[PDB]
Amino acid sequence: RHVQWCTISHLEQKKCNDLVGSCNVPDITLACVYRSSTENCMAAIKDGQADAMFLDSGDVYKASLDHYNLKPIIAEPYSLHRELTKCLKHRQESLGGDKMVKGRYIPQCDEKGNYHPVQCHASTGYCWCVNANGEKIEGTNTTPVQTPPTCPSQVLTKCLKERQEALGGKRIAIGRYIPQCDEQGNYRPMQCHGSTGYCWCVNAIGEKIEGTNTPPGNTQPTCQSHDWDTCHYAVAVVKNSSTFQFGQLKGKRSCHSGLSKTDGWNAPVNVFVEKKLLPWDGLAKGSIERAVSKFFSASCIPGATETNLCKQCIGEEEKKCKSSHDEPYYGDHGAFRCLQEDKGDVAFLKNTALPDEHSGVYELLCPDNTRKPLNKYKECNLGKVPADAVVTRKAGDKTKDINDFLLEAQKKKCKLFGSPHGKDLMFDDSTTHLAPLPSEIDAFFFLGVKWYNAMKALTEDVKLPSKNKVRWCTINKPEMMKCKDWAAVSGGAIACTEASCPEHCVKQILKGEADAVTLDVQYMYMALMCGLLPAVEEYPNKDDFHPCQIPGSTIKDFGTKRAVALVKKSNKDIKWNNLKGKKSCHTHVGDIPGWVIPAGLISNQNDNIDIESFFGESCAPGSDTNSKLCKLCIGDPENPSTRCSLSDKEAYYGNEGAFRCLVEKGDVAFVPHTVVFANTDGKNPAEWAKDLKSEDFEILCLDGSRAPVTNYRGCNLSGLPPRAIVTREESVSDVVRILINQQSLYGRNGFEKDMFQMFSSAKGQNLLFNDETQCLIEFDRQPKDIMEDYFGVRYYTAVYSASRSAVPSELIPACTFKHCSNS
């Protein structure tokens, strides 16, 4: 296994070469490939000449475009603010679940708010070991007949971990820095070197605050406590011997980290434009680089083409003004050197490149036309900037080898983040740890929509789609065709986009390529986790059309299905809490009322034991024919095996089929509440349902009681939420207004229903909306968690344990990735 790293300079190649010799990672060999600039390395990775490089966030955006097709895979984790510990959040969510779902696991947290390594389930007496995230160590379950297990102690905090490393077996590491930790195990704001007498400030995760390093005998700056804001900040640094303010930058000499860098270009230019220091607003006034060329008299901006923007660079011959360390003024520490050597009056870089020392001739140039000390960058900056990242090809053929090497190299403490040859070679010198990013992350989700759009805005005039048009996302060709017919009559209110599946529609809406889509319940958790909201919902009640005639009216019964546990009146011995070992009948594996809801409740109350193992002998079409979930399944009256199959071949398949399994050979069936009324009172002419009576059956309540099949509203496993039309938060009002108007024309009572019908089509079934939809009802947003608000507390608890930590789609870790954005 090999990893070929692309270096952009002679100095970087020299550092990478040193790591080839010094860093011994078994199974994986590192190699270094020289190219002359950042862009030439990006092309080399696209072409397979190399596999990976570290990129500024600005270049991460540029590399994501079709010219290069690279994606970020590894980056240093950062924090926006202090958050609740995971255990305490889990405790709060589980305590906020539906109290009628009895016997649920409530985590046990310690005096620091973390998980006790031993976790136990009160109602079952089962205990197990967990990791720091409270996730069960599989295979450590112990039954109540045994003593609770012996579980390893929790992993130490970063400060205590590095304290024990610094000591390293010895009881005192003499002459070396030993971190000082508080009582929660986080870094004390003030840190001091036990031998040199120097002191400085750190944030809560131990990152040094620039401009606070203080030699002994001097007054140290005040160190802020509980600092969990670890995003990097773009800053403008100047010497205290000058006197101009930010608003007087016109005509000055400037040093920038680079033309493509976010801290050296995007952040200052963004502020120049918003403060109208630059006579520029759109691509009609030329390029941004030309406008900046008119603003400054002479600058060093590596990568620039304009002559005066390269005048101050000091690279030799072809190396001058190159995006490469061979240009001595390239990068954050090159821009600072350019100011230090008086080739510029101001340098544009980020806080992590500022001097550590408090005393000196440098200060910060704030955009509010004041100047402030180095350590006040959080209140004197040009914005938070995104993290930087290791990138590779979008195909990800080398992602695992790159991740494995860097993980092993960091474990062995290889010299990744420093070098005698120079600063910020291969990686930023400020970097302390590099971690894998979510597997589905791309530049959009890594940078965030705010910074992604801001970067795009400097390259093209982004025509923002109209708020009076709803771009509908379709998932197949017939839907696209019905949507094109809708657009033809809509007068421009409706347009169409094409995706392959509902999740890609969610992605399109997030990225501003579409505006709305109708989602099955099984996709709503991922949609809500990613930040979309229900705008309107499909109202399915055929008995009451009054909420559809008069909008906004009160709804007596939304009419969605209710999952129930159906048993016979004769079997008086069976209640909810003894279904273990009985004979269950499921419509099919994957059905929400017949499987997902029952399996969720069984898992919540029996330590995630398999619904396979929970019952005795069952019929659940979808399982393996050899399992006990198909023993009850009768294949086909016309024997071919078609047993336990997902077709009408299996006699026990579906709503009516699970009702068959109950009466024939079974004692409990998981079905919607409508199944018993549809197949009793002689409503089914078949011989098995020969005038079977509805009063012959009852439904099981979660409190151990029973009730007649008519009271499904108060004795159910869970009611399903309706299907929802989702959109972005800022677009809910427009989508609601446009859809309600379209419904007044082409709904079931539309004034123009002869021209188009929203809820039917000759092109197929359930296109765009379900064909049985009565109308769309605006979602009445309540002051609660959107998860509980949309799903209902019962469904939320039964299927998701009322938790925001489920991952039913790998898109969720990518779309919930936190960003370094500004207001």
Ligand X SMILES: NC1=N[C@H]2[C@H](CO)N=C(N)N3CCC(O)(O)[C@]23N1
According to CB under 6 A, which one of 281, 397, 520, 780 is a site residue for ligand X?
Answer: 780
Work out how close the CB of 726 gets to ligand X at its nearest, in angstroms, rounded to a whole number.
Answer: 12
Residues contacting 675, CB < 8 A, separation 6+:
566, 655, 656, 658, 659, 669
Between CA 64 and CA 391 the distance in angstroms is 9
Work out how close the CB of 712 gets to ligand X at its nearest, in angstroms, rounded to a whole number.
Answer: 15
Stretch that binds ligand X, among 49-57, 84-92, 642-650, 777-785 (CB under 6 A): 777-785
| Phi, psi angle pair for 810, to nearest 5° | -65, -5
Residue number closest to ligand X, CB atom: 792
According to CB under 6 A, which one of 258, 789, 804, 819 is a site residue for ligand X?
Answer: 789
Query: Which of residues 221 and 502 has its CB atom nearest to ligand X in the complex?
Result: 502
Query: Which of residues 206 and 721 has its CB atom nearest to ligand X in the complex?
Result: 721
Stretch that binds ligand X, among 107-115, 596-604, 735-743, 776-784 (CB under 6 A): 776-784
Between CA 510 and CA 728 the distance in angstroms is 7
Closest of 350, 338, 364, 354 to residue 240, by C-alpha:
364
Beta-carbon-side half-sphere exposure of residue 50 (alpha carbons within 13 Å): 26
Stretch that binds ligand X, among 4-12, 166-174, 703-711, 778-786 (CB under 6 A): 778-786
Work out how close the CB of 504 gets to ligand X at its nearest, in angstroms, rounded to a whole number.
Answer: 24
Site for ligand X in 298-337 (CB under 6 A): none
Helix, strand, coil % over all residues of the chain, rounded to 5:
30, 15, 55
Query: Which of residues 103 and 808 has its CB atom nearest to ligand X in the complex?
Result: 808
Work out how close the CB of 772 gets to ligand X at its nearest, in angstroms, rounded to a whole number.
Answer: 16
Between CA 122 and CA 146 the distance in angstroms is 14
Work out how close the CB of 721 gets to ligand X at its nearest, in angstroms, rounded to a whole number.
Answer: 4
SS3 665: helix
The residue type found at 110 is D
Residues contacting 272, CB < 8 A, separation 6+:
249, 278, 292, 295
Work out how close the CB of 474 gets to ligand X at its nearest, in angstroms, rounded to a whole number.
Answer: 23
Query: Which of residues 558 and 677 has its CB atom nearest to ligand X in the complex?
Result: 558
Category of 365 on φ-ψ map: left (φ > 0), alpha (ψ -120 to 50) or beta: beta
Q: How far apart are the first and last CA of the chain?
A: 45
477-490 helix and 732-746 helix, angle to the nearest 10 degrees: 80
Work out how close the CB of 555 gets to ligand X at its nearest, in angstroms, rounded to a whole number.
Answer: 6
Stretch that binds ligand X, among 23-31, 453-461, 789-797, 815-823 (CB under 6 A): 789-797
According to CB under 6 A, which one of 206, 722, 747, 750 is a site residue for ligand X?
Answer: 722
DSSP lists the bridge partners of residue 586 as: 670
On whether the CB atoms of residues 250 and 227 are closer than 8 A, the answer is: no
In DSSP notation, 422-482 reads -SSSSS-TT----EEPPTT--HHHHH-HHHHHHHHHTTS---PPPTT-EEEEESSHHHHHH
Closest of 755, 767, 762, 769 to residue 489, by C-alpha:
755
Query: Which of residues 555 and 634 has its CB atom nearest to ligand X in the complex?
Result: 555
Q: Assess 782 for contact with ligand X (CB under 6 A).
A: yes
Query: Which of residues 12 and 789 has its CB atom nearest to ligand X in the complex?
Result: 789
The residue type found at 599 is A
Q: Assess 721 for contact with ligand X (CB under 6 A).
A: yes
Count Cβ atoms within 10 A of the Cβ of residue 155 and give its class: 0-12 exposed, 13-18 middle, 19 or more buried: exposed
Work out how close the CB of 592 gets to ligand X at its nearest, in angstroms, rounded to a whole number.
Answer: 14
Query: Which of residues 541 and 757 has its CB atom nearest to ligand X in the complex?
Result: 541
Closest of 87, 128, 122 to residue 108, by C-alpha:
87
On whether the CB atoms of residues 98 and 247 are closer than 8 A, the answer is: no
Between CA 679 and CA 686 the distance in angstroms is 9
Work out how close the CB of 782 gets to ligand X at its nearest, in angstroms, rounded to a whole number.
Answer: 5
Query: Which of residues 118 and 555 has its CB atom nearest to ligand X in the complex?
Result: 555
Work out how close the CB of 720 gets to ligand X at its nearest, in angstroms, rounded to a whole number.
Answer: 9
According to CB under 6 A, which one of 54, 330, 790, 800 is a site residue for ligand X?
Answer: 790
According to CB under 6 A, which one of 537, 650, 698, 734 is a site residue for ligand X?
Answer: 537
Closest of 232, 425, 238, 420 to residue 331, by C-alpha:
425
The two three-digit tokens of residue 486, written as one number: 């809708």
| Phi, psi angle pair for 204, to nearest 5° | -65, -25
Residues contacting ligand X: total by CB under 6 A: 11
Q: Assess 428 for contact with ligand X (CB under 6 A).
A: no
Residues 669-708, one symbol each (x = binds ligand X by CB under 6 A, - = not), give ----------------------------------------
The two three-digit tokens of residue 487, written as one number: 């657009």
Work out how close the CB of 597 gets to ligand X at its nearest, in angstroms, rounded to a whole number.
Answer: 15
Query: Which of residues 514 and 720 has its CB atom nearest to ligand X in the complex?
Result: 720
Site for ligand X in 376-405 (CB under 6 A): none
Closest of 812, 78, 200 to residue 445, by C-alpha:
812
Work out how close the CB of 557 gets to ligand X at its nearest, in angstroms, rounded to a whole number.
Answer: 9
Between CA 667 and CA 598 the distance in angstroms is 15
Closest of 697, 669, 686, 688 to residue 588, by C-alpha:
669
Site for ligand X in 7-26 (CB under 6 A): none
Stretch that binds ligand X, among 105-113, 374-382, 401-409, 786-794 (CB under 6 A): 786-794
Stretch that binds ligand X, among 10-18, 236-244, 603-611, 779-787 (CB under 6 A): 779-787
The two three-digit tokens of residue 510, written as one number: 């997030």
SS3 354: coil
Work out how close the CB of 790 gets to ligand X at its nearest, in angstroms, rounded to a whole number.
Answer: 5
Stretch that binds ligand X, among 152-160, 219-227, 785-793, 808-816 (CB under 6 A): 785-793
Query: How many residues can be counted in the chain?
Result: 823
Work out how close the CB of 523 gets to ligand X at its nearest, in angstroms, rounded to a whole number.
Answer: 14
Site for ligand X in 552-611 (CB under 6 A): 555, 558
Q: Which residue has the tokens 């979660």?
A: 702
SS3 528: helix
Residues 69-108, one symbol each (x = binds ligand X by CB under 6 A, - = not), give ----------------------------------------
SS3 525: helix
The residue type found at 295 is F
Query: Which of residues 257 and 718 has its CB atom nearest to ligand X in the complex?
Result: 718
Work out how close the CB of 764 gets to ligand X at its nearest, in angstroms, rounded to a whole number.
Answer: 26
Q: Assess 657 for contact with ligand X (CB under 6 A).
A: no
Work out how close the CB of 699 gets to ligand X at its nearest, in angstroms, rounded to a whole number.
Answer: 20
Q: Assess 520 for contact with ligand X (CB under 6 A).
A: no
Stretch that binds ligand X, among 170-178, 181-189, 228-236, 782-790 (CB under 6 A): 782-790
Residues contacting 255, CB < 8 A, separation 6+:
299, 300, 312, 329, 334, 335, 336, 338, 339, 343, 344, 346, 347, 348
Binding site for ligand X (CB under 6 A): 537, 555, 558, 721-722, 779-780, 782, 789-790, 792
